Amino acid sequence: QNEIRILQDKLNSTMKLVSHLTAQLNELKEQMTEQRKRR
Amino acid sequence: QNEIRILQDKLNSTMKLVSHLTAQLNELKEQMTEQRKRR
Numbered sequence: 001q002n003e004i005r006i007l008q009d010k011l012n013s014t015m016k017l018v019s020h021l022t023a024q025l026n027e028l029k030e031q032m033t034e035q036r037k038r039r
Numbered sequence: 040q041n042e043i044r045i046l047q048d049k050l051n052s053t054m055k056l057v058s059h060l061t062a063q064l065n066e067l068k069e070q071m072t073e074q075r076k077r078r
Contacts, residue, residue: 009049012056013052013056015056016055016056016059019059019060019062019063020059022063022066023062023063023066026066026069026070
């Protein structure tokens, strides 16, 4: 049961990592938009 | 006591996860605003 709780925490961490990846993609899109605006 | 410190670290991680969820919601709102602007 303690391992199951740890597994649930790991799943939450995986969800956070997925959100971080989405944030990184958004940052890349923002950087591309800034570059286009500068040009 | 060491477990209590680990629990405190886990609570900090949970707070970070909550902040990450808020950031994801903000990113979704930004994406919706960008879509509305494009339309």
